[PDB]
Amino acid sequence: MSLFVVNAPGHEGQLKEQLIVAHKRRPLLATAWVNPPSVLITNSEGEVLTQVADPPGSTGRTHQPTALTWHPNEELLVIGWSNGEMSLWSMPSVSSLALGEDYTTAAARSAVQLIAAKAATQSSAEGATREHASGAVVASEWSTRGLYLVSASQQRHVVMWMLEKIPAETSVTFKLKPLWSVQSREPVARIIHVPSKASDDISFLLADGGTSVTAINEDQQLFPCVTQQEQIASVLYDAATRTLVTLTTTSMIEVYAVGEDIKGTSTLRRKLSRIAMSMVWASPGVVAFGSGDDRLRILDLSSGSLDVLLLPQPDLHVSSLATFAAKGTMIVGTVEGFLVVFQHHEASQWEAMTVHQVGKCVDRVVLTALGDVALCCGGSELQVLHEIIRKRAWDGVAAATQISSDMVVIESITGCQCLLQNKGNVHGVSIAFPNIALWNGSQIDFYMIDEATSEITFINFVLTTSPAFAIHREGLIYVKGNRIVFETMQLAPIAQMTFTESEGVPVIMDIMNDYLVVVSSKNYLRLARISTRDLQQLGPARPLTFPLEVSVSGARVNAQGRRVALMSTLGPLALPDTRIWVYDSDTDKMSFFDFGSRNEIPNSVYWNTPEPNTTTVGEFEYILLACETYQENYAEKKAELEDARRESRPHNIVTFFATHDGLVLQNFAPLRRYQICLVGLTIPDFLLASVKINGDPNNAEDYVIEQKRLRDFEGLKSDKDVAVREALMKFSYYATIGNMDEAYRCVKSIKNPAAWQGLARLCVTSGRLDVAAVCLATMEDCVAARALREAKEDYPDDQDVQLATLALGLSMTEEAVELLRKSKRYDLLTDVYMACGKFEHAQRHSERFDRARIRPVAYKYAQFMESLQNMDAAIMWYYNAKCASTDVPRIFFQTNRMHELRQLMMITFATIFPQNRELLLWWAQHSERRHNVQEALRFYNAGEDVYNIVRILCSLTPPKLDSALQLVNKEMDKAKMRFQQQQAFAEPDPVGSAYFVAQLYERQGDDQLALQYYQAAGAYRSGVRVAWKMEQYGVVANLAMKSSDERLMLETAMALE
Amino acid sequence: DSSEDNLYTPLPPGYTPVTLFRGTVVCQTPNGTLETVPLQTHNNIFLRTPNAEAFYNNFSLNRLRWSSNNITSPQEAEDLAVKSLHMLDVELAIRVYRQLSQPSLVLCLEKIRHIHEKNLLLGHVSMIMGYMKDAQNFFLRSSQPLRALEMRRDMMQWERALTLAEQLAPEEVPIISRDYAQHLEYRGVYAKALEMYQKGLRQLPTGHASTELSVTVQEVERHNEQCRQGAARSQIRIGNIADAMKTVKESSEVSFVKECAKLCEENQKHEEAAQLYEKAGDIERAATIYIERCKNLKAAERLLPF
Amino acid sequence: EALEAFRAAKWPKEAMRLMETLATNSVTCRKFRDAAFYYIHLAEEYGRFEETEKPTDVEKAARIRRSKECVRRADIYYAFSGVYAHTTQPLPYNELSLFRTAKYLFGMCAESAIPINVGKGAILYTLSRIANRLEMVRTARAVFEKLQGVILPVSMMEQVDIETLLVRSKPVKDRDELLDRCFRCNQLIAQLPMAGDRCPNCFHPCVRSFVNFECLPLVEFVLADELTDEEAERIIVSGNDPFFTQLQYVLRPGRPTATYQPFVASADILKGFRRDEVFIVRPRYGTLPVPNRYYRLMRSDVSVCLCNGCQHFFIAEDYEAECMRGSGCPLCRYRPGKQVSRSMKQILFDMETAAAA
Ligand SMILES: [Zn+2]
Ligand SMILES: [Zn+2]
């Protein structure tokens, strides 16, 4: 998280939209004002250096500065006025003094820059009004090497100016001499330069806002380069690839390739689907533009594909654009007053880094050399915004968090809260309760905190420019020169220590409890112990090795003064780095961890901060490190809806265990949008600064010091016991290092079941089971214990299913379903999906992966509706489970809805039920129960159940033998059809119903017919008993052996005798 | 918001009620006409919309399955679930708990949704709610008393499990002790571990010779070997040296004798330590301990060539 | 038919997965006949390994135990199908067969953990109502006082209260024609069978039929450690009750009656008897080595048969009558004289005919 400190140096005049100029490399900035017309020259951070009034020789008339331009290398400014004159503002160079290299601090360099700019000179170029024909100088442009100047007036004239850098006795002066006098069609809106070689030649382009883009070279002729059918709006040029882009007022863009003679050939032509359109270079070969709408548009010249970069907030309209190619940041300014900063990791590769709300109509956005954002807003308002990190501090009693340019919220865990507004800005904050101190560059102001009356009593200031300072209970430590001085709150000098220039100047100073860490500008680190009288240094300076240029930006020290966490930045532009550095001074070892693998960039890193008069803190609590980084279930959500309403780039609070064997990743925790920042670590409680309920982040009062328990400290809300807490710390440490046996040993002495559920979760994540049985048995959770025991009994060869069962018992659902996806067990996964009240997921999983447990899903839904007593869906879901022969009749009979079933079966329910075969057979059986024989026969015929029809027909009085014989012979013909098909592919299938017919003949003496129909039916046992009748015994053979029934053959062998 | 006053419905004056029917009672006017007076107890009990009063009226009248239709807050769902378990209605309990994010409880309830004996179901419900003594009593009075054992072993209350196993399962007494002994080996307590390992010996099963009998015999043998190993190791831990050394020498496992040989020096019984060091599988460390602690050169003279 | 396809090509892994999934589906959907069929086939296949693998002895014992568990589950589900149909559906039923089924379920439901979707309330209600209808008044009041201690559906308590209050009248005497008889003890089983359906005097589980669950004149025993199965039948063919002394070792006062003591026979006993007097049951768990069980046949007027795919006992006339339903054995759906190739082409031909319409 970052915030833009705002400097708004007012001027008596009115600001101009496009008249802000920023030097590319030197931290300089200048802008024009009118009535009274002047120019304000300021540094990158926004402090005013100088102001320059009307050009020399003016006869009482103030002249409006109409054009400004910076020299690409020299700290030289050129100003074209409105009366035809031209002036050059030049300050004496700092390096001409040939002083020492003691300018290692920004404040000293700013001071020498200011004292150099005080004696600056504004020189007049002779005869400028003659060359511009008494016309206002509309535009100006230096060459790439800064040797040639081009000026354009309002009288349609273009003049070439030669720069002569002559040496003098004390400095180097500059003379501008006119060379040409070139006529233009219209006053030139923009002058661009083309270099001969990609990285002294004459190659310029002039755009006058009309239908002409006139090139010019050393030939002194204004030959056009490219002319289009419409009036041009703007031109955007890439010097490295010599790529020109012409944009018209009608949302038309053309891409040209500039040759040696400044001639363009069209290769990419495109159309875009009051604020004038703006267009800037987002990346080499990638152009970003906006048409005053809510969307950005990004064009890739290499591929020709145009994408739209969306803004989630409606009503926003882009007003101006700028880009910083060094870090890849676009600064979108809006009419409302919203500044959006985009940082690179074609539209999918960009992201919104941050959002800022200045709150005024942004006329123009400019970017200085160091990355500061100058803003012309409100017509006559200049605001320089400098990105600084959120300066937050915590001592052990209260937290002081910076939330704006100057507002600081100081709040304690006891309920005390107060607001601090510094007279100047805020750059550093140090708290050692009740002492508070703020550093704003030039001076450090230290006050007290009156907790009883919520007052802040100002003690005093020290006029020091040290970037490193720290206030303590006994006094304040601040750097002054090459030395550091530790004093009291009443400016009583207690001690001081001095360092040589070869040892550098301290840049980082961090104190906590009674330990101090000092880091210089050349990676020199010193650790010391503060006392009541002296500062006992522990060892000499130690160099550190980092396996462009690495500069350490921050240093934190644990409460032992033994291990140091280090934040470093890359390059002179201070690009944040994705590495955390841990240094063990006692063992003199250097370890690091990379945040690039997690796609995260850190902001701050914090050690554990023990409370005052609390000496029961072990070294495992001291080695813990915390850092902030940034990249069907209807009665379920309402339980956490209170938290969801308490909610009214992602945050990652990540904690490591700093080990002498290396850095081990302990735990990770996402945050929410109302938890703005982490102010420090107070074991076992995170100290996230948060906004209150239904609050606003920009409000100063709307801030509370929120305290959330660690993810490894579940179930410990008393925060009183010490032995349990330290044993849990050791358990977490041994779980992270993988020493699960020592974790078991540590939790064995803990009577809190929270340690046991932590160990059970560790067993889930480590594949341990017999220890997990003890974990479940210690928490008095017999449900999970018996579930694990049955899982072991049912699956003795699979530990994955047992682990999934344990995780499900431990309220770990997502881990369990992922494990069961890994473990192939889709049926158990479907059962779990049903058991969590998600029948839609069960249906999808059944229809996608395992298409064999969809009937259980339907049946379980039917039972769910039956218990819910929504029978309208219960009946249709019992039908969908293909169990309409046992359950839908049951659900009709039990609810006494028999009349509706009778009406349904008499022939949404009537569309499906009457034609179902199983329902018809059930109703036939039910009517046969009611002795309604004829209705049963009718329904059996409608359901095509030959066995039951033959049984009833043969059981009737008189027996309807003819139709029974017809059906029996039809089934015999079907069986013979099957056997003939089998033989053509190369004793048919017996027909059971024929058995009944034989029984009739068995009661009528028709022995031969009874035997024939028994044999056709497959009644070998009855075949024997009917073969015994007259005399035949061979027919007894070939029957028993067909059944492979040993008893039959045995008995026949006995009976043959 | 009360637990001692019964709710009262004010009957209109001059009424003698004669029949309650569907929550409404017919009261006879002094003229003899019958007028229907509705009880406020049965208010809105035929309404299936999210109304709290209807849910409470159904809840009080044990209309639990009907009240499942009308639930307004998750707390009311929790009340319905705990009451449904309280009324021994597991079929409704599963349906309610499917909407309360307890998949383990639902899965374990689906295993007991079919049981109907009130003692056994009462014991299971008591175990689920966390009333172990009542659950044990119900299981003991039910048709499957062995559940009363399984709750103790799963909770590893080995004293109560062994107390129950003395009359329920005579053959389960050793195994239950053995794990206990192993747990005792974690606590530093070895004196009662000796008794637990000694009682852990299982008599040899006898019967018809087959694969099942052979596998049971092998399991009994392995259990006996583990019990004797633990007993000997704990004997060496406490100081019973001579008794444990015979068992150590009888076996052949190298790791077991290696673990047993370490603790003999602390009790100043260096003769058995000397005997075990040479057969521990290493001679260099044995000779180092000889020359540093034992100082018995006669034994080291034999190990000199190696 | 995909399960039959898997079993035709051996492949035990996918056959196991499919059969277990089908059995679980049938249990969850209360297809108790289907569940019994799937479970008995799972027990049959649990000893079908791959030919390239030689299983260990421990795995063999574990799979034997799982096969016996599946056999017990299949028996319980097949018994419970008709009782559940009578309890929850207005369907035609037999009375004496349902009574004996209820007695068997009561006997074998308390032996071990009851399988899923087999309820004690339904079986107790069925037994009570049938005993009241068949005037088994002493049995009716015994099972009613047992039924007092289970849970019944919300539309059953009033009726069961009325039934159990009315049953307290009438003389306390049960009919001697519909009582189970233990041929081992030669005594009628007047009291309800205990856990495992065992005789009060002998603790031996009675050998019922498996269509109407009526008792059979068979006595179970296991051979000693020095006998086989092949030679016994041939010795009996080549050429008063010897077990009575063993009987005197069972019901004699002072003898240990905590657990059932099986009858034991040696080679001396397996001689000098009738050829058909012995029934040899080889439990079909596949290729797993399991010793055979033996049964003495007390009487000859009752015909008993064994399904070649189940080796359960059935009444021969009732087995033949049930085989006409179009499945075969009611528990196994087994049909003799079936070739794997012909039946495997039958499903293809049926698919062709179904695709035509
Ligand atoms: Zn008996
Ligand atoms: Zn069979």
Side-chain angles (χ1 to χ4, degrees), chain A residues 764 791 795 798-809 812-835 845 849-850 853, chain B residues 103 107, chain C residues 17:
Chain A
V764 158
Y795 314 97
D798 198 323
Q799 278 64 28
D800 296 333
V801 48
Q802 314 176 17
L803 282 176
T805 295
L806 174 64
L808 200 68
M812 312 296 252
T813 47
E814 309 175 12
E815 297 81 358
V817 300
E818 182 61 36
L819 220 171
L820 279 185
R821 277 196 295 261
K822 185 213 67 61
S823 183
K824 188 260 311 172
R825 307 315 298 255
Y826 293 139
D827 45 357
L828 306 182
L829 186 53
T830 311
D831 293 331
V832 169
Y833 274 141
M834 277 153 35
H845 183 85
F849 299 95
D850 183 18
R853 281 214 180 188
Chain B
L107 285 188
Chain C
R17 189 177 185 180

